[PDB]
Structures are given as structure tokens and as C-alpha cells.
Design a protein around this ligand. Structure first.
Ligand SMILES: [Mg+2]
Ligand SMILES: [Mg+2]
Ligand SMILES: [Mg+2]
Ligand SMILES: [Mg+2]
Ligand SMILES: [Mg+2]
Ligand SMILES: [Mg+2]
Ligand SMILES: [Mg+2]
Ligand SMILES: [Mg+2]
Ligand SMILES: [Mg+2]
Ligand SMILES: [Mg+2]
Ligand SMILES: [Mg+2]
Ligand SMILES: [Mg+2]
Ligand SMILES: [Mg+2]
Ligand SMILES: [Mg+2]
Ligand SMILES: [Mg+2]
Lengths: 223, 66, 125, 86, 180, 186, 155
RNA sequence: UUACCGAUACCAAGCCAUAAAAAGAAGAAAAAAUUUUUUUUUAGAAUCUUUUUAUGAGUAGAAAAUCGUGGGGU
RNA sequence: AUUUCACUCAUAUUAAAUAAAAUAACUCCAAGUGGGCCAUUUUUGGUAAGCAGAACUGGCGAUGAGGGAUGCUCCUAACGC
RNA sequence: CCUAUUAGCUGGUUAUUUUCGAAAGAUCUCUCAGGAUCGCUGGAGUUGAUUAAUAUAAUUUUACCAGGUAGAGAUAAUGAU
RNA sequence: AUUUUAAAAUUAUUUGAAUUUUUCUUCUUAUAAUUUAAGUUGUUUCUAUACAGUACUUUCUUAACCCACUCGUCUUGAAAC
């Protein structure tokens, strides 16, 4: 039994080591990509052309309207997304179908392209996780990696950093990770919304559009 | 007295409480009143097949016995 | 309000009085749940009587404990005292209302021997 | 297992480290970066300036071009208006 | 820096085009400067304008670039002319208004207030068509001409906007509006 | 609030605890529940569930039927969570090893004669706690006469549901709507 | 009040402009099998076998074929529940639906792709990738060919 | 343009109940006294115990668990 | 067409996404209900109506809380302590 | 006295908590103040699911049909003009 | 009464590397302790050297701030003139 325990410990240590390297790699990538974007922009500026950045792959979508006075279609869409309360946020893999769905629920949500730091913050401060036999879940905050290394061991994402990476750049194993994440129960924003009635792109003050960068600020406020 | 003589109001909602239930989709719908002649031919074929199978089984049994 | 004493949290010192028990003598204060369309208590309008609810319940661990921290056990007879020789810290005796003065005294004596608290030792004193 | 607190990963250093093993190294790096004194930074500014000239020029050209385009558009609009009036 | 004073209208250069098709591989790109409160708003405005002018909708085009133009000399007073299209409750109108300001953005901020105030024209109903600095030989509006006068001077007839600390509701002595 | 079905809480549709107060049966369920939970063997769980079930869903399994089921694999032990009844319609009885909740006396006798074994559930557990070399069987469930009145109501076309009638004979439910001659049929 | 078998059919069953006449003689050669999906498109030039108003346009599995008939299992939404309706039609109205054939084509192509993959042992992702976001690009445009835009004045 | 105030909604934590989920047929821990005494506990009730997570509006209505009255056997 | 043999079709990203999708199906027994009313939007009759009559959806009814001074239905938002 | 006649109508219909929770559509009815039967609800139960699956979805993509309302037309047909 | 362990983290030691040359540089070989782990612990007063006091807990009674319409009932809708 002691021997077995020792073996287990060793395995754990190995996993941790592996994780660290992976994390480092991810870090290296992130900065590099950013640098490259800048370089590309510079090149474009130099040589008359334009560089359009890659369309943003994920989208963090925060619900605004609550449960009452909602059409059936929109309710269905919400259910599909997994936003059930007023300020349930969730990551969503931007697609064609997904986009269409969003458009159907556009007036009842905000969304945008989260940004890595914001995502990380969400995962750490607000990231809970479904831990149980399928359809019987229990919303557990992560803290340890063993929590998540169980369910997502198969798919080669142990620990929160891997998950974060997956989220940021819709990886091979994004969907599963997203599913594993219990919908983000956010606060209301500490300075406040402008007006949930009106759209974000309305020239007057509003909220419900695709605030495509500025979502991050909102998230920060309401983390 | 005069009445709300008809409305389809709420009906949809009512329907959607237990979903619009699909038919269960069974592999074998009955061939009861469908194409005669053909279906009797089919029946005959099936019978023949069964007979063949039985004969085979019998043969096997015999072999086992020695 | 909430009535902390130590680990004992009581969520509701006030009794839930029957609606309108204050208005008509015939309506006793014993809680009765208002059925009836238009009740206002049933409908829970601000400013009316509250409805007892399972939210008000005391924590499973401290529930029937008195301010003593001891479960009350009512006792009619010396024999009954004996179950609580092995539980003299967790349970406290109350002597039944119908027990005679001599018998009461005897019970009290027994309790003292056991070190078990008696919550109504003073009856007929 | 009995649920206890839920520890604030972002701050609670130990918890953070448990979560993300690499984190420590990153934090050390950050600290190191923070450490280095302002003289060096100041010096680097000159270098940056030296390196920037071409880029600056390019930027100017771009923005100038944009402005020119706008002006041309305006002129065209004016001409159109004049024509309409005529 | 003062955040009570700011109006957060910026100017954005947006460039976009229709997505290439087998039938039209090399489509035209369109640009514009757009006065908007943020980058996303700017984009949306651009899309709207594309829709209005060309056959082009956000779903069948792509934004090539969104730049953000910061004023080059944000502390030089300039005389800005603007040409608007706006909608009244009764109908639709052009007008040309002039604003002496420190940046295009500032002028536009002024403009929106003025249209809201003077015509009850809300931001939705307005379309800025061009703003350009008018050199003072061609300034047509009298309220701008006056400012352009040689050795400009005037007294300070505004009332004090004391800080909320020293705004106290009981006063020893009846304050004076004259000052000097 | 939260837009959910049944608000959060998960419906479970079946039995929970046996409503029986039969001390032996309670003991049995205790045992098999324990076995289910520890020896997560499926078999055990199934057994537990069947023990919990009501009397109609523990229909009697006939000796003949048992024999038929055992036919292909001999020696292994048929387990039946209900009663096993004897069959006069059988002639010969093979060497059967059967666990059941109840054996009707004659059936038991027959089994004994066959040189077989009647095992109770505790015995089975003792012998085969993971149900190795066992076979769960059920008697005919929807063969009940009550069940013949269920389904589509007689009146709906192509329904083979017995009407609840006082008696049989021409005088009772054999005219209008039962023959083309009296309006319609079925 | 008036719910006859051809009500609300002034346009459903009207033959389209410059397509009167009758069903072409080559339409009777469409091969059908017990399982084919099948549109029901009421050519009202034949009055025999005319399926009801509602089934016009609705597809279904063929469950029965006859001399000149086709039984079609078609779903009908009926208040609280969809149910299977056995619509017996002539061939003139039943047209072979095309949805299934799109799938069929894909299947065929996929088989070939699978074979190719096996030839070389590779993890080819078959499943249709939906229109995702576009990747990064660097689009060369001359400053000559970038037509600046302003809103339009009113007229 | 900021800042603020502002719900039984949101968030964090606690407690109640419901639902489901984990999981369960042997042993010294401490303090106080002065190495030995005294003080409390030293659990194992399956519709039960421990822990977890989510959820909690409600007339007509349905159900379950409780509470009480007159009498019966124990 | 059915049958039995072959050979072989993506699969852990699961033959496009997304899904507190099995809280599902199904059977049984029975309750209450079968006077409705309002709001947007579409709409019929009518000069119109807080009128009569419909459609889609949501409410009220059965529902309090915060706002609309006040208010069965508007806005926010649905309620264990 | 039969007789506590009958009433599709009016009034009333007695403890607590917890849990789930409607309908005021539809068809037939000497029916329109009622009833039956569907619908919606509860309970009971079984088979399932418990394997982040497959069934399944008031959802969307990708194909593929069906349409004749808004619009449009009158130097296209009909009917105005 | 052994997931309040394990590991993470930290301190003081010990072996070997690394390019972020660094009194918080990182990993790892071993060893001890610690808490940032592994949901509040301590110190000092007070109640008090008290047996009920004017303190403490609690009932009632008044005020005060805010709120609160007659319950039952048929009814789409009752505080209803
Ligand atoms: Mg606001
Ligand atoms: Mg609204
Ligand atoms: Mg009411
Ligand atoms: Mg409730
Ligand atoms: Mg009512
Ligand atoms: Mg409401
Ligand atoms: Mg008002
Ligand atoms: Mg009478
Ligand atoms: Mg409910
Ligand atoms: Mg009445
Ligand atoms: Mg029509
Ligand atoms: Mg028209
Ligand atoms: Mg008041
Ligand atoms: Mg009335
Ligand atoms: Mg009333």
C-alpha cells in the first residue's frame, strides 16, 4: 500500500513537472503572437497594404435580461448557451451557427472578445467546475488541479493553465473544457451599466451589443 | 351570454410543456393492409428460410450425436 | 431579529401570530395559514404579518437545545431518570407538571446525585 | 470532503502556485524586471528614438495620405454641389 | 488629467471591403473617418454607412483596419466647419455649422450638444458629412468671426463654481457676483 | 431567478424505499443494497431494485418458463426476484438450481424431486455475492388481466383493450360500435 | 364552417404561370423504394390521388408502393404532438426529395477520403467544419484603389 | 460627462428544507490539577449518520411528513 | 424483398454547431379547469370606445419585491431565513 | 305524512409544514350558468439514463424543398380608371 | 480514528544544472521545522471574586422611523359605492 502511495506521489510530481513546461510554452507563445501581430501591422503600414487580424474565435457572453417576459426561442437559445440567471456569463466558440444564435439573443446579452488576462482572472476568481457523474454535477471551485485532471486527463489538459489556454485560443479540446466550466456567476459591475434597454452601438448610452473589445473592461468591473 | 367563442391562445404553450412529442419510430411498421401478393410472397420466402435453418440445425444435431 | 447567545442562533424570537388575531377575539393567536383569495398575508404584502416558513428553522446541530445547551427531557418517575446517567451533560431534566411534592423532592435528590440539571427545581418549593 | 473557504487563487500565493506550477518562475521574472533602475530605461529611450525615425516618417505619410484623400473627397462633393446648383 | 471635463468622442479611420467572391475576386475597399465614442461604435457606424451607400453589409464584408486618429496639435485653437444631415420629426435637412475648437473630436462633441439643444436632434438622427478646418478668411458664421478678432479681451461675468468643500450652505457675508 | 426545468431539483420517477413492513424483506433489501453499493456489480443493484418493486412487477414465474430459460446454459443458477409457481403442464423437471423470493409449496416439492435446489436470496448472496454464473429472470409482467384494460381505449380503432364489463354474452357490449351492422366497429 | 377537402387552395393547387399543361411523361420514371424520402407536390392537373391541402410541400418516407400509388409517412403537428399520417397519393404528386441526396453525395466522398487516409494512416477530420471566423491575412491594396466614403447630403 | 443612491434580482458567506450526489454495518483526544488523580466526550439509530452541490414564488388542485381531540388493545 | 455469411465505414471529439440533453420515454390512476382578461406587433367589424372579434408571443389570473406619487397587466425583477 | 322530495343555481365546507402545480383551448352535447371526452397537473409505477454518451431539443448551421402575405405592377392577364 | 493527509508555499540547511546574474533567480537530491497550505486564532480587560440589582436574558407596555386598506366570498378584476 505504501509502495502504491509512493508511486502515485511520483506520478503526481511528474504530472506537475509536465504541466509547468506546458505553461511555460504557452507563455512563450502568447507574447510571441502579440509581437508578431505588431510586426505585421508595421509591415502593412510600410508597404501600403492592410493587415486584418484573425476574427476572434471565442466570445464571452454575459446575460442582461432575467427570466421573465422572454420569447420562447430566446429562452431556448439561452438554455443552449447555458446562461440561465441574469449575470451568468459563459464562453462561446464563435462559429456560424453560434453567431446566428447570438443574433437571436442579441438584445438580452452583451458580449465580446475576452482577452487573455481577463480570461485568466475569470478562471481563478470566478471559475467553478462540474464535478460528478454525468447529469449530477456539483459546482466546485477549482483550487487543486486533481479536480480537473480527472475529467480532462484523457484530452491532455491537466491544471487550470491548460484550460485557460484552451479558452483563449479555441484549441482542439475547447468545447469539452467549456462544458466542464460551470457558467460564470458574475457580480453586477461595480460602477454600473449604462442602460440595459439600449444597444451598445446606439449613439445614446446602452449595453446589449457585441462590445467586441470593451467586454473585457465590463468583466473586470463585474468580476 | 356572449362568449370568447374561440381562441388558440396559450395552446402552443400548453403543447410545449410536455414537448411536441414525436412518434416513437419503430423498426417494423405492420405490413397488414399493405401490398398484397408481394407480402404473401415475402411471407413464403421467410417460411422457406426458416425451414432451411431448422434443417441445418437438425443436421448439426445429428453430427453432434454421431 | 436574529438572537445569538453563543453557538445557538435563533432566527426569529417573535412568535408568528395568526392574521387579524389582534382584531377579533374569536381569532386566537395560534398560527393558522390564511387560505382565501385576497388575503394579503398569503400574498405577502410589505407590512403585514409574516408567514412561518422552513427558512426560519434552527441549525440541525443546535435545534432543540435550550439556552443551557442541553436537550430537555421530561421526567415523571425515578426509573426514567436512569437513562440519563450516561448523558448528564447533554440532557437536563424537567419534572412533569403532575408529580407530587414528595416525589418531586425525591426526583430532585436523584438528579443531584447524578449531577444532572433540573430546570424546574423550585416547583412547590 | 468538507468544503472549506475556497481560497482566492489570484492572491493566496500558495494556492496560486498549487494551481499553476509555472507561476512562481513567472512572478520571479516579473520581480526581476521591476528591479532594474531608471537610468537604463532613460538610456534606452534615446535608442528607441533613433530606431523610430523611419517608422515615424511612415506613420506621417500614412496619416497625411488619409488627410489628402479626405480633402479630395470634400473637393469632389463641393464640385458636385456646384454642378447641382448650376 | 481632468475626467469631469472630457467628451469621449474620438475619430476613427475605418477601412473595410466586401468579402471576395469567385465572380469578383478583387473588390473595392472603402475608407472613412468616423466620429464615434469608441472603436466598436465606429465600426458599427462604418457598416451602416456602407449599407446606405454601397451594397455592403457586415456579414459579407470584412474590416481591414480601424486606426484611431489623435489630433496632431490638440492645444491649437482651430475653426472647424461641419456639414450635417439630420432628421427632424417632420423631415430631413442639411446644415453647415461652425465650431471654434481644439480638435475635430471636440468640435463634434460641441456639435452634438448644439444639435440636441437647439433642434432637439438626437445623436441617432444625425450624420456628420465632413469636418474641415476653415482658415479665418472664409469663416461665414458671426459667432466665430468675433472670436477671430485681433486683440481679443473680455471680462469674466461667469459666477464662481466653488469646490464642494468650500460650498457651504450657511454664509457669514452675502457673497459678491461683481468680483472685479 | 433561474430558467430551469423543474427548478434545479432532479425528478426520480420510481420507487425509493420498499413500502413493505415485512421484516425479512427489509433485511433482504438492506443486504442487497449493501452489496450493490460495495460490490458495484450491476447484478446486485438490479436485485435490490427488484426487491423494492411492487407485487405486480414481481409476477410469478412458472416452472416450465424457468426450465425453458435455463435450457441453453445448464448448471448456472437462475435467480427470480418473485414467486415461482409450479406447472402441471410440465411432465419432466431437470436438475434445477434456482434462487427465488418465494416458492409455492408444490413447485418446491417438484424441484426437490428433480434432485434440484431451492435457494433463498441470502443463500444466493452467500454463494454468489457478485452474481457470478447467475441469471436474472422475470415472469410475464404485462400478462396481468388488469393490463389488458390499459393502452388505447376500446373505442379507439385497432385497440386490443378489454372493456370493463359486468359479464360476457351478446347482451353486454356487443352491438353499436362493435359490429358494422350497428353503426360502426370498435 | 366550410372546411372542405380543397379549401384555401386557390393558390396552393393553381399551376404556375406558363407551366400549365400536365405532368411530363418522364416524371413517371422516378424510381421509388420502401424508405426513399419523398416530397408531396400536388400537381392539380391530375385530380385523382390529390393529397390534402396540408401535405403539399411536406416530405416523407415511402412506406408503401402500388400500381400507381405511393403511401407516404408524413408528420403532422396536431396541437400537443406530432403524429404519423399515412398519405396515400398517386405518383403525379409525389416527387423525389433532394435533401437525402446531398447527404448521400457527402457519404460517398467521405468513403473515398477515408480510403485515402487508410492508404497512408492519417487523422483526417471528415465532419463538415462550419463557417468559423476568418484567419489572419495581409491584403495588398494600392492607395489608388481605395475609394473614400462620406455620408450623402439629403435631396 | 462623471459620481452617487437604489430591490425579495445579482455576488460572497452562514443557517433551514427539498432534490440529487458522494459514502458509510471500532478508536483515546485534550485540558486542568499534582508521575498520578479530576473534567468533559470516547459516535455507527440505513425513511439512519456524515459530507457535498444545486434549488426554494404560487390560487384551483395533487401528494408526503408532521400536530391535536373522543374512545380501543398493548 | 427477406435471410446468413463476408469484407469496412468518422468515434473519444463524438459522420455540422450548441445543450444543468435521461429532470427522459412509457403505462396507470385521478384532480382541478373547460366565464377569462391585458400589453406590444399583425388584424376584422365599428365614427370611435376602458367596444365586439381574431393571430404571434409574453403577462395578469395564481404574484409578492424595487420603480411608474397613486394602479390586477407598464419597467426592473420573479420571493426559504 | 310520502320527505332529509329535487336543484346543472346561491351560500358555507374546520390543524401545521414541505413538495409539485394548472386551466379558462378543443370536439360532441335541447348545448352556451352544466356535462362528457382530449389538453394542461399531481401521485404511483416500470423501462431507461447514470459511460460529459446516444435517445432528445419551441435553437442554429449546411443542403434541400413548400409558399403567394408585406412589397411591387397597371404601356403582363382579370376588374377598375 | 489518516485525503487538516499528500503536495503547494516559506524558513534554515545540502546535491546538481539553467540564462531571466538575480539578499523573493528558478527548477531538483535530501533533511528538519513552520503557514501564505489544511474555513480564527491569540492577548488584555469586563461581566465578577456575582446568586439578582438599576447590570444580564425575557415578557408585556408605551413611543419613534418606515411600512400596513375589512376579512370571508363569487369574479378577468374587491379596500370597494
Ligand atoms: Mg444607470
Ligand atoms: Mg422591454
Ligand atoms: Mg385574486
Ligand atoms: Mg413552494
Ligand atoms: Mg379564477
Ligand atoms: Mg408579476
Ligand atoms: Mg404617473
Ligand atoms: Mg331539503
Ligand atoms: Mg415550482
Ligand atoms: Mg355563478
Ligand atoms: Mg392567401
Ligand atoms: Mg399590397
Ligand atoms: Mg402607508
Ligand atoms: Mg363581473
Ligand atoms: Mg376581498
Amino acid at each position: 500500500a505504501a509502495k502504491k502511495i509512493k508511486t502515485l506521489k511520483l506520478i503526481n510530481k511528474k504530472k506537475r513537472n509536465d504541466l509547468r513546461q506546458r505553461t511555460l510554452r504557452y507563455e512563450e507563445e502568447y507574447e510571441s503572437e502579440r509581437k508578431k501581430i505588431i510586426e505585421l501591422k508595421r509591415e502593412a503600414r510600410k508597404n501600403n497594404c492592410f493587415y486584418r487580424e484573425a476574427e476572434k474565435k471565442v466570445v464571452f457572453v454575459i446575460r442582461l435580461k432575467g427570466v421573465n417576459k422572454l420569447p420562447p426561442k430566446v429562452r431556448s437559445v439561452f438554455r443552449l448557451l447555458r446562461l440561465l440567471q441574469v449575470h451568468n456569463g459563459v464562453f462561446v466558440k464563435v462559429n456560424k451557427a453560434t453567431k446566428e444564435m447570438l443574433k437571436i439573443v442579441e438584445p438580452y446579452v452583451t458580449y465580446g472578445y475576452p482577452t487573455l488576462s481577463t480570461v485568466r482572472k475569470l478562471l481563478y476568481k470566478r471559475g467553478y467546475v462540474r464535478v460528478g457523474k454525468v447529469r449530477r454535477y456539483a459546482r466546485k471551485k477549482i483550487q487543486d488541479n486533481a479536480d480537473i485532471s480527472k475529467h480532462l486527463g484523457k484530452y491532455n489538459v491537466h491544471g487550470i493553465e491548460d484550460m485557460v489556454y484552451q479558452l483563449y485560443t479555441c484549441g482542439p479540446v475547447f468545447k469539452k473544457v467549456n462544458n466542464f466550466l460551470w457558467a460564470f456567476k458574475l457580480k453586477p459591475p461595480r460602477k454600473g451599466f449604462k442602460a440595459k434597454r439600449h444597444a451598445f452601438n446606439e449613439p445614446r448610452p446602452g449595453d446589449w451589443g457585441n462590445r467586441e473589445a470593451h467586454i473585457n473592461e465590463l468583466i473586470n468591473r463585474m468580476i | 351570454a356572449k362568449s370568447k367563442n374561440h381562441t388558440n391562445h396559450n395552446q402552443n404553450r400548453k403543447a410545449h410543456k410536455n414537448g411536441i412529442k414525436k412518434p416513437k419510430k419503430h423498426k417494423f411498421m405492420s405490413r397488414k393492409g399493405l401490398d398484397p401478393n408481394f407480402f404473401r410472397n415475402q411471407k413464403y420466402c421467410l417460411k422457406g428460410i426458416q425451414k432451411k435453418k431448422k434443417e441445418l440445425k437438425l443436421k448439426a444435431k445429428q453430427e453432434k450425436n454421431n | 431579529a436574529v438572537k445569538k447567545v453563543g453557538k445557538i442562533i435563533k432566527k426569529r424570537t417573535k412568535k408568528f401570530t395568526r392574521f387579524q388575531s389582534n382584531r377579533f377575539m374569536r381569532v386566537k393567536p395560534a398560527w393558522r395559514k390564511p387560505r382565501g383569495i385576497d388575503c394579503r398575508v398569503r400574498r405577502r404584502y410589505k407590512g403585514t404579518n409574516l408567514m412561518p416558513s422552513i427558512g426560519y428553522g434552527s441549525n440541525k446541530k443546535t435545534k432543540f437545545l435550550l439556552p443551557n445547551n442541553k436537550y430537555k427531557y421530561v421526567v415523571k418517575n425515578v426509573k426514567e431518570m436512569e437513562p440519563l446517567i450516561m448523558n448528564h451533560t447533554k440532557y437536563c431534566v424537567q419534572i412533569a407538571h403532575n408529580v407530587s411534592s414528595k416525589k418531586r423532592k425525591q426526583i430532585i435528590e436523584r438528579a443531584k446525585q447524578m449531577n444532572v440539571s433540573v430546570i424546574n427545581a423550585k416547583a412547590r418549593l | 470532503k468538507k468544503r472549506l473557504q475556497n481560497k482566492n487563487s489570484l492572491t493566496n500565493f500558495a494556492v496560486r502556485c498549487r494551481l499553476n506550477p509555472a507561476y512562481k518562475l513567472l512572478r520571479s521574472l516579473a520581480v526581476l524586471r521591476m528591479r532594474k533602475s531608471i537610468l537604463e530605461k532613460s538610456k534606452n529611450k534615446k535608442e528607441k528614438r533613433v530606431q523610430k525615425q523611419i517608422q515615424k516618417k511612415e506613420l506621417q505619410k500614412i496619416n497625411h495620405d488619409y488627410y489628402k484623400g479626405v480633402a479630395k473627397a470634400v473637393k469632389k462633393k463641393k464640385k458636385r454641389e456646384e454642378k447641382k446648383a448650376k | 488629467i481632468d475626467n469631469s471635463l472630457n467628451t469621449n468622442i474620438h475619430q476613427y479611420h475605418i477601412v473595410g471591403r466586401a468579402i471576395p467572391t469567385a465572380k469578383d475576386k478583387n473588390p473595392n475597399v472603402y475608407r472613412m473617418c468616423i466620429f464615434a465614442k469608441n472603436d466598436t461604435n465606429a465600426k458599427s457606424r462604418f457598416w451602416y454607412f456602407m449599407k446606405k451607400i454601397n451594397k455592403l453589409k457586415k456579414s459579407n464584408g470584412e474590416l481591414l483596419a480601424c486606426e484611431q486618429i489623435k489630433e496632431r496639435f490638440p492645444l491649437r485653437v482651430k475653426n472647424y466647419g461641419v456639414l450635417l444631415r439630420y432628421d427632424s420629426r417632420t423631415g430631413t435637412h442639411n446644415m453647415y455649422k461652425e465650431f471654434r475648437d481644439t480638435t475635430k473630436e471636440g468640435a463634434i462633441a460641441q456639435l452634438y450638444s448644439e444639435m440636441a439643444g437647439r433642434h432637439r436632434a438626437r445623436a441617432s438622427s444625425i450624420n456628420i458629412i465632413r469636418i474641415s478646418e476653415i482658415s479665418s478668411s472664409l469663416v461665414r458664421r458671426p459667432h466665430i468671426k468675433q472670436l477671430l478678432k485681433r486683440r481679443l479681451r473680455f471680462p469674466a461675468l461667469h459666477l464662481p463654481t466653488l469646490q464642494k468643500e468650500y460650498r457651504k450652505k450657511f454664509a457669514s457675508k452675502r457673497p459678491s457676483t461683481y468680483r472685479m | 431567478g433561474i430558467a430551469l426545468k423543474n427548478v434545479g431539483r432532479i425528478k426520480k420517477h420510481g420507487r425509493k424505499h420498499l413500502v413493505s413492513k415485512n421484516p425479512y424483506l427489509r433485511l433482504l433489501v438492506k443486504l442487497y443494497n449493501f452489496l450493490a453499493r460495495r460490490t458495484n456489480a450491476n447484478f446486485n443493484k438490479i436485485i435490490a431494485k427488484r426487491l423494492i418493486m411492487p407485487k405486480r412487477y414481481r409476477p410469478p414465474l412458472s416452472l416450465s418458463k424457468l426450465q425453458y430459460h435455463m435450457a441453453n446454459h445448464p448448471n448456472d443458477i437462475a435467480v427470480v426476484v418473485g414467486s415461482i409457481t409450479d406447472d402441471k403442464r410440465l411432465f419432466s423437471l431437470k436438475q434445477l438450481k434456482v434462487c427465488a423470493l418465494r416458492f409455492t409449496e408444490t413447485a418446491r416439492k417438484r424441484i426437490e424431486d428433480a434432485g434440484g435446489e431451492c435457494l433463498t436470496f441470502d443463500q444466493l448472496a452467500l454463494k454468489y455475492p457478485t452474481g457470478k454464473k447467475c441469471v436474472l429472470l422475470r415472469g410475464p409482467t404485462k400478462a396481468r388481466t388488469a393490463e389488458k384494460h390499459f393502452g388505447k381505449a376500446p373505442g379507439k380503432p385497432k385497440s386490443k383493450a378489454r372493456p370493463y364489463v359486468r359479464s360476457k354474452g351478446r347482451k353486454f357490449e356487443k352491438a353499436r360500435g362493435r359490429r358494422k351492422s350497428r353503426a360502426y366497429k370498435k | 364552417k366550410s372546411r372542405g377537402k380543397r379549401s384555401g387552395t386557390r393558390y396552393k393547387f393553381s399551376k404556375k404561370f406558363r407551366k400549365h399543361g400536365e405532368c411530363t411523361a418522364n416524371k413517371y420514371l422516378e424510381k421509388l423504394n420502401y424508405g426513399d424520402y419523398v416530397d408531396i407536390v400536388c400537381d392539380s392537373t391530375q385530380q385523382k390521388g390529390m393529397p390534402f391541402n396540408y401535405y403539399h410541400g411536406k416530405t416523407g418516407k415511402i412506406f408503401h408502393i402500388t400500381k400507381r400509388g405511393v403511401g407516404v409517412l408524413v408528420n403532422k403537428r396536431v396541437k400537443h404532438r406530432i403524429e404519423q399520417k399515412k398519405v396515400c397519393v398517386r405518383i403525379e404528386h409525389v416527387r423525389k426529395s433532394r435533401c437525402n441526396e446531398d447527404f448521400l453525395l457527402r457519404k460517398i466522398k467521405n468513403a473515398e477520403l477515408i480510403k485515402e487516409a487508410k492508404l497512408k494512416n492519417e487523422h483526417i477530420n471528415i465532419k463538415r467544419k462550419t463557417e468559423g471566423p476568418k484567419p489572419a491575412a495581409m491584403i495588398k491594396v494600392p492607395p489608388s484603389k481605395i475609394i473614400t466614403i462620406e455620408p450623402l447630403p439629403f435631396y
